[PDB]
Amino acid sequence: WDNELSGIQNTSVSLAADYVYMRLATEGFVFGIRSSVRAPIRLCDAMFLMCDLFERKFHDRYIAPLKNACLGISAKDMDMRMFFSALDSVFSSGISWSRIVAMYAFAGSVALACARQGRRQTVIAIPEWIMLYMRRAIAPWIHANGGWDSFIKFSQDVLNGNH
Ligand SMILES: [Cl-]
Ligand SMILES: [Cl-]
Ligand SMILES: [Cl-]
């Protein structure tokens, strides 16, 4: 059954795969998992560029809280439970497009840390971590706040206003 929530979920995990492998490539880890861009191109562009902007210009507001939640966990021990707990530590106070960008950016950070430790099977699972995490609260929030199209408009506004 194709319904709007399952559609949002399919888009979220396609996007998570694109973003994780793109982020890895920016540091020279070229996994070659994908044959093509999996999410819609405009959305893939939007998430990659928003994550980059947040890493460069909004790191301590959006990304540091997730990293700090994981302080003292080695890359060898990073797992989906850690990932969920860190995300919970922010989303417990609310959901926003900026916090969703932070979740994807942080998944990239975790992927990079695992790739540097050679934990290949963990890296390739991180897109599923995002998909599974979003089922309980993020996915219905996205549905109620305009779908991924609303993220595109948000991203266009933010990216057009930063230079
Ligand atoms: Cl529907
Ligand atoms: Cl790839
Ligand atoms: Cl809200």
DSSP string, 88-110: HHHHTT---HHHHHHHHHHHHHH
Reading the block at residue 161, the tokens are 């206003």
Quick check: helix, strand or coil at residue 34?
Answer: coil
Domain total of the chain: 1
Contacts of 68 (CB under 8 A, 6+ apart): none
Calculate how far, in angstroms, residue 151's C-alpha sits from the geometric centre of ligand 1. 19
Q: Which two tokens stand for residue 139?
A: 């996915």
Radius of gyration of the chain (CA): 15
Helix (H) / strand (E) element for 18: namely: helix 4-26
Q: How many CA atoms lie within 13 A of 158 on its CB side?
A: 20
| Among 82, 127, 131, 133, residue whose Cα is nearest residue 108 | 127
Token code pair at residue 25: 């490539």
> What's the gap in Å between 63 CA and the centre of ligand 3?
20
> From ligand 3's centre to the CA of 76, what distance in Å?
35
CB-CB neighbours of 81 under 10 Å: 9
Amino acid found at 63: I
83 is written with which tokens?
Answer: 């990932």
Cα(119) to ligand 3 centroid in Å equals: 36
CA of 33 from ligand 2 middle (Å) equals 4
Distance 124 CA to ligand 3 centre (A): 31
Contact 12, 131 (CB under 8 A): yes
Quote the ligand 3 centre to 12 CA distance (angstroms).
19
Structural tokens at position 133: 């995490």
Full residue range of the structural domain in which residue 55 is found: 1-163
Could you give the CA distance from residue 132 to residue 139 in angstroms, rounded to a whole number? 10
Phi first, then psi, for residue 50 (nearest 5°) are -65, -45
Distance CA 131, CA 12 (A): 6
